[PDB]
Amino acid sequence: KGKRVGYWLSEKKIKKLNFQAFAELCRKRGMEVVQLNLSRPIEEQGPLDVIIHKLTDVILEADQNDSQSLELVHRFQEYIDAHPETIVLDPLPAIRTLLDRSKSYELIRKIEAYMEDDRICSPPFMELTSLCGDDTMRLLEKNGLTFPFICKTRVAHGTNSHEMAIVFNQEGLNAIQPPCVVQNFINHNAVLYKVFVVGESYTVVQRPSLKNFSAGTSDRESIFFNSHNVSKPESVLTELDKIEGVFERPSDEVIRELSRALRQALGVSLFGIDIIINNQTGQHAVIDINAFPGYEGVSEFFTDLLNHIATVLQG
């Protein structure tokens, strides 16, 4: 009781999360919950014990030299600075890394090489700004990529944030849309583990996923898909032909500690990780990472989130 929560979320995000029902829940626990108007001064709307937000679009527009958004981001960052006792779910530098796939994957790569756990090794990736003619694949190869590989948007947010294409041969290269991030497709017996993290708690949801494909080049057209759509509990795309190689459940110890290093490196708390078991190596691989996802499905979300807010206020 008497705790004030300020939030800022787009109409669309509010709707996906059923966030107003969540706000009212908080109110019944004695909290005050206010929708922050970032165009007015934030003191006037204070004091604030917690701010929960997803300011991604504003962050993107500010980088694009948008006057409005630049001002919004400044006033918000300034208020945060002036009030280090306000808990921000989640810090602005965390959003900025997670919105950009070449940054987030580089983070994962450094975290893995930090963790010194042989149980975890994610696929090679690169930022491919442009095709370099007939020799494009020699560029990918220089960077440890070959067919089949999976090009994704650099920005992990927006309309086409999860629109993707898997490419199997030279003739299929016309499917790439640069600039983009390319990442080797790793066979994993068509099972994805979606990990939804809400602070210290996490839920591992097993989901469908793309099937196994032969190594190197295949004589087959590039496949356009949406990663969110494919992996709904929800194609011939996701029907495993046969089990090959390593086919095991993921380790809760690897998932915990991955979650923890992420939260520590970034001060992030609301995010999801997509994990597969590489069927060659048996290692866990992070194939994507999403700031503040829809938590679509997900059992006990409101509880976990209320628990998380109470926990950080406890610190």
Q: Is 50 exposed, middle or buried (0-12, 13-18, 19+ CB in 10 A)?
A: buried
- Please state at what angle helix 19-28 crosses helix 301-314, rounded to 10 degrees: 50
Query: b/e map of 104-129 (b: 16 or more CB within 10 Å)?
Result: bbebbbebbeeeebebbbbbbbbbbe
For the chain, how many structural domains are there in total?
2
Give residue 288's identity as a one-letter amino acid code. Answer: D
Domain of residue 179, residue span: 91-294
Distance between CA atoms of residues 291 and 273, nearest Å: 9
Distance between CA atoms of residues 138 and 173, nearest Å: 13
- Strands 201-208, 87-89: parallel, antiparallel or unpaired by DSSP? unpaired
Distance between CA atoms of residues 293 and 147, nearest Å: 29
Known binding positions for 1D-myo-inositol 1,3,4-trisphosphate: 13, 162, 194, 290
Residue 142 sits in a domain whose CATH number is 3.30.470.20
In sequence order, which residues have a C-beta less than 8 Å from that of residue 145 and are 6 or more positions away? Answer: 124, 125, 126, 182, 183, 184
- In the chain, after which residues is the C-to-N distance over 2.5 Å, breaking the chain? 234
Known binding positions for ATP: 101, 152, 183-194, 209, 227, 231
- Strands 201-208, 191-198: parallel, antiparallel or unpaired by DSSP? antiparallel
Cα dihedral value 315, 311, 56, 9, nearest 10: -120
DSSP string, 75-112: HHHHHHHH-TTSEEES-HHHHHHHTBHHHHHHHHHHHH
DSSP string, 38-72: TTS-SGGG---SEEEE--HHHHHHHHTT-HHHHHH
Known binding positions: 13, 101, 152, 162, 183-194, 209, 227, 231, 274, 288, 290
Distance between CA atoms of residues 97 and 63, nearest Å: 13
Decide if 199 contacts 311 (C-beta within 8 A).
yes
- Whether 210 and 261 map to the same domain: the answer is yes
Distance between CA atoms of residues 149 and 100, nearest Å: 19
Residue 74 sits in a domain whose CATH number is 3.40.50.11370
- Whether 176 and 198 map to the same domain: the answer is yes
Angle among Cα 260, 262, 266 to the nearest 5 degrees reads 125
- Whether 302 and 203 map to the same domain: the answer is no
- Strands 50-53, 87-89: parallel, antiparallel or unpaired by DSSP? parallel
- Whether 134 and 239 map to the same domain: the answer is yes
- Whether 168 and 154 map to the same domain: the answer is yes
This entry's atomic model was obtained through X-ray
Decide if 286 contacts 108 (C-beta within 8 A).
yes
Written as six digits, the tokens of 251 are 């380790």
Q: What is the DSSP letter of 231?
A: T
C-alpha to C-alpha distances, 308 to 197, 199, 205, 229, 265, nearest whole angstrom:
10, 6, 20, 29, 19
Give residue 212's identity as a one-letter amino acid code. Answer: N
- Whether 35 and 137 map to the same domain: the answer is no
- Whether 289 and 307 map to the same domain: the answer is no
**Strands (DSSP E) along the chain, which ranges?**
4-8, 32-35, 50-53, 87-89, 125-128, 149-151, 163-167, 180-183, 191-198, 201-208, 223-226, 270-277, 284-291
Known binding positions for Mg(2+): 274, 288, 290
Cross-strand partners of 52: 7, 89
